[PDB]
Ligand binder design. Sequence first.
Ligand SMILES: CC1=C(CCc2nnn[nH]2)c2ccccc2/C1=C\c1ccc(C(C)C)cc1
Ligand SMILES: CC1=C(CCc2nnn[nH]2)c2ccccc2/C1=C\c1ccc(C(C)C)cc1
Lengths: 196, 197, 198, 197
Amino acid sequence: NDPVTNICQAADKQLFTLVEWAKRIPHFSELPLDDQVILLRAGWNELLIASFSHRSIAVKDGILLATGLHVHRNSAHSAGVGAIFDRVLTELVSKMRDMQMDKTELGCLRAIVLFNPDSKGLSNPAEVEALREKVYASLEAYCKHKYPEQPGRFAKLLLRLPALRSIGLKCLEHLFFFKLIGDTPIDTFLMEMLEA
Amino acid sequence: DPVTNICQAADKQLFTLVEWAKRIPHFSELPLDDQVILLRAGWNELLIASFSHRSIAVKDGILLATGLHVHRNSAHSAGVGAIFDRVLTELVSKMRDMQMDKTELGCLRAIVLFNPDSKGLSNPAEVEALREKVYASLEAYCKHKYPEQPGRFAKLLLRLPALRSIGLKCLEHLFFFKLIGDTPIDTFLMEMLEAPH
Amino acid sequence: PNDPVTNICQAADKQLFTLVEWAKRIPHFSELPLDDQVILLRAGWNELLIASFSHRSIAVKDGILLATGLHVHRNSAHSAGVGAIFDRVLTELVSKMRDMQMDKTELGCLRAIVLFNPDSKGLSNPAEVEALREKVYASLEAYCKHKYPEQPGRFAKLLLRLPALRSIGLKCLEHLFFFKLIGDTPIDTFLMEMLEAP
Amino acid sequence: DPVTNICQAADKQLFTLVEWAKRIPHFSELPLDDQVILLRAGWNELLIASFSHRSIAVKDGILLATGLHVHRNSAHSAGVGAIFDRVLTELVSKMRDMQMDKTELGCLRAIVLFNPDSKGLSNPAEVEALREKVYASLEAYCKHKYPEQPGRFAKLLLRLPALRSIGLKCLEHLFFFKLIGDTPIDTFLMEMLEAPH
Ligand SMILES: CC1=C(CCc2nnn[nH]2)c2ccccc2/C1=C\c1ccc(C(C)C)cc1
Ligand SMILES: CC1=C(CCc2nnn[nH]2)c2ccccc2/C1=C\c1ccc(C(C)C)cc1
């Protein structure tokens, strides 16, 4: 009934999904708790974007949110975030589709993103760089075994990260996720009050 | 818990705003989708205008509606100090020095509300006509309430560009998040991390 | 020729000077301390420029007429990547100036109000600048009421284009609007000639 | 003139950038419209990558092409202390510590240049294919230069997200203007004021 509160609840649930995921990554929970907070704050955007972009591989012209919401271009443009939507489709989803990025590869990429040594305030960044290195070593080993005819695949996966970074910035800037899940609930709320 | 309080308080502020808009003469005569466009386009400036005027009783700080006081120290610490000082020096102090009264504030807000430039309006001309009715009322008010201050009406209108730019800066730099949403997110996260897995 | 940025700078240089020459003609402006004059010009230059070319562009439909003679159309503005800001200028300023037939006296007054901006950071004496601003808008009001007595709402309507000018000014500075407009083509040209060149 | 200095310096950098691109294998075989697009999409990151690597021999400062040495003092003074520190911590110091050499730098810049995401590219796939050739070559080089660092190749590619956000932040904050254009403009304006009448 109360739109902002419902939106926050949805944000709450989403963020907790991410926290549980990170705790299942080997060695994340062994890091200091402050450093864990720092990594999740620094990374939550790209992590969520990476996640919903891969999920949207099977669908036409849209984004599947973890909330179940199926966002089309029209809706995204209605919410004032059509440009960013387009970029997600073009630079992430379609490229994920085209190379058939699998779930193991996505997880490794998200774990790389999570273990971001550049995150400000890290008591021990070198330690975080070292976890990231273990992760990418494993991803490379995986790609070579699973896709031997594709020697450049590991690098191709790594090279989606600059795109993810810039889209992540734009999403943070324009409150992408919040505008999408909130736009219609706000219109609906407003309309009900305005008619009463 | 901190985050929950913020969301509820936002929901309350949104409620009060819509109720205020409905009592504005002729607002409800507009097509409902236009009323919605206007409220969504105006909420930020409308809010900044209110808390600025409410803050004239305070030195170098701001009063958000729930008796929540924020000092410029906290703004500067959070990295939004320059913006906070623009609120203080371009809105608050100016409102204080001219003794902007509550009728003049209500009019400025109604003018902000009736924004004919808002994208998607089915009829911007009707919105411009409602805006002109409001500023005609305001000019009538100022002339008769303050007949010894001939430039007062204009002075009030000339606080609107400051409101516009401060409004943009606030959103651009996540002013509100950095002031009142930052720490609660840290707390929120720590709790999640400590939760049973 | 062969130095695209230099040429862009010369054009901007010439444009800013037109603004500075206009300001020195505004009564009392040159009586302010020099450092205040510089503060006012830096704070106001973008809005002053936008206001000038917007008003100049009433003479055309769907374009911006620059002081040099360059007529910028929508296609150029789109190529330049600033189509959105371009459309705001046309919609919020040009067409609204046209709708009310804002005249050159009113344009001059509105720009002088913009120049005498008492919120400009660092002014030695902000009240002195507010005092000059107040003189200007009293003159503008008496002018509108004398020239257009049948439009009692005109003065206020003029002032009420200022918030739009403010937001568009911020967007223009942010995306280097003016510089992309006068600079997009010469850059492509310089690049192209170089890439074709042996 | 100081401003005239800056413009001429930028024209120089542009010229050198273009001549560099032409010497990148297969670059000139792309459509000319596509070459222009890539150079325009890439110039900012390409410049930042170069002055960052150039600054490794410099203590607590940044070196711009004309021996223009910029220290933290100036950066903090200009309100861009934060971005300055990012360039040092995320680019300059990481380049230094892993001893990124000019061949690796060259490969990374070429990867940047061959950006298949650039808007308006007539054939994105063609650009992506050139990127892959460049990165295969960079991997081959890392393998023999440091066979005992199997993670060097990936480590190099993983500075590119930092370069991307740094590039965006520099533009958003007018980083270069605030550092080298700010005072010259004051001088320029004062000269304009000294002109007759
Ligand atoms: C728009 C907004 C964001 C979204 C991000 C943002 N955009 N601009 N500033 N912050 C945010 C995030 C956290 C906390 C608040 C906020 C906020 C606005 C707000 C909420 C509550 C109050 C009162 C009732 C206390 C006042 C303003
Ligand atoms: C992009 C840019 C602006 C436009 C505004 C801007 N955007 N991002 N930063 N500044 C500007 C303005 C004034 C002076 C420089 C600049 C500048 C970049 C620049 C120019 C010359 C050099 C030389 C040293 C090779 C280096 C960088």
